[PDB]
Structure 1
Amino acid sequence: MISLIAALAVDRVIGMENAMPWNLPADLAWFKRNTLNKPVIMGRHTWESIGRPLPGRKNIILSSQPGTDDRVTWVKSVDEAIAACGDVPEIMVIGGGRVYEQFLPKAQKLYLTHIDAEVEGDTHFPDYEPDDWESVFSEFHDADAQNSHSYCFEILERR
C-alpha cells in the first residue's frame, strides 16, 4: 500500500528543508522510524532539498526530465514510480506538494506531524475529505531543550 508522510504547520503549510524552521529531532526520528527500509517516492524539488539519498531506502525521484544522478531511480509518471517500488508492503511518499496531491487518492495511510507554528508559506498539504479518513493514532509533545516547537504525531487510515 501507499502512505504519505508529511510535516504540516498551521493551515497545513508544507515546505522544503531550508524553508522549514523547526528543529524536531523527535520528528526526524519519527520520519526515519516510519520510512526505514521502505521505498521513498519524492518529487525532484524535494530530492534537491535533501541533497543526498536517504540511506537504507530505495529512493525514487519523479521528474519529467531524464535523471541527473545515478544514485537514485528516476521515473516519469506516478504509475512508473509505483511500479519501481516492486512488491513491498508499504510505499512512502515524502512529498512535496505536487507529489502529495497526485498520490493522496491512491493512499491508505497518512503519517502527519502537526507543528504548532505559523510559517511563511503558500504550499499546503492536499485537502482530503475527513469523511474518508480515520485518525487511529496521535501523540502530542511540548517543545523542549532539543525540540523547538510543540508537535503532534498522527496516523490516519483510509476507511
Structure 2
Amino acid sequence: TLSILVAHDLQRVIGFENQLPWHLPNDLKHVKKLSTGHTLVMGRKTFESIGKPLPNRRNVVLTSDTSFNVEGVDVIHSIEDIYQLPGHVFIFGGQTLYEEMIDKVDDMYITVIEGKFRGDTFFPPYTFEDWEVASSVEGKLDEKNTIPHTFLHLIRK
C-alpha cells in the first residue's frame, strides 16, 4: 500500500517556519499507531525540521544531496525509488512531496485540524469527488488536546 499521512488545517496549512503550527498529542499517537512497523517517506526539509528518525519504523528521506547520511535513515534520490520500497509506505511530507505524490497514492490518512493557522506550507487542493470517505472519526478534546480535529481515511475512487 502507498498512502499519504498528513495533518492539515481548514485552509490546508501543514507547516509554519519548519514547525507544526499546532500542538496535538492525539495526532502524534495517530501517526505512531498508523506507521509503527512500516515505512515513512519524507522530503529533506521535513526530516531536518524533525531532527532525528522516528522510532520503530523505516525512515526514508528523499534528497538530491549525494552526501546525505544519517544513522537510522535510508536515503533515496528520485520519486521512482519510492515504488521499490516494500510494505506499507506512508508519504509523510512536506508540501513538495505531497504535490508530487497526491495523484499516485492509493489512499490518504488525513487529520483535519478544525482551525485557521498562519502557514507557509500547504497540502495540495483535493475534491471529495475523487475520494471515498472510508472513515471519519472526531478526535477527542481534553486537557492536552484543545483543537478540534477529525481523522479521515480517504480512498481513491
Q: TM-score, normalised by structure 2?
A: 0.91
CA distance in 2, matches of 1:118, 1:25: 18
Query: Identity of counterpart residues, as a percentage?
Result: 35
| Aligned twin of 1:69 | 70
Aligned ranges 1:13-24 → 2 under 5 Å: 13-15=13-15, 19-24=19-24
Which piece of structure 1 moves more, 29-38 or 19-28?
A: 19-28
Deviation at 1:17, TM superposition (A): 8.3
| Aligned twin of 1:54 | 54
Q: Which runs of 5+ in 1 are unaligned?
A: none
Which piece of structure 1 moves more, 67-76 or 41-50?
A: 67-76
| Aligned twin of 2:118 | 120
Q: Which runs of 5+ in 2 are unaligned?
A: none
Give the root-mean-square deviation of aligned CA atoms. Answer: 1.7
| Aligned twin of 2:102 | 104
Give the secondary-structure state (helix, strand or coil) at the position aligned to 2:135: strand
CA distance in 1, matches of 2:48, 2:107: 25
Cα deviation per residue 1:28-59 (whole Å; 9 max; x = unaligned)? Answer: 10111111111110000110011111111111
| Aligned twin of 1:10 | 10
Look up the equivalent residue of 1:109 and give its one-letter code. Answer: D
Look up the equivalent residue of 1:118 and give its one-letter code. Answer: K
Give the secondary-structure state (helix, strand or coil) at the position aligned to 1:60: strand
CA distance in 2, matches of 1:136, 1:37: 22
CA distance in 1, matches of 2:17, 2:156: 28
Q: Number of residue pairs matched?
A: 156
Cα deviation per residue 1:108-157 (whole Å; 9 max; x = unaligned)? Answer: 11111111221111322112243221011011135320112111111000
| Aligned twin of 2:128 | 130
Structure that is richer in strand per residue? 2
| Aligned twin of 1:36 | 36
CA distance in 2, matches of 1:36, 1:16: 26
**1:152 and 2:153 matched:** no
Structure that is richer in helix per residue? 1
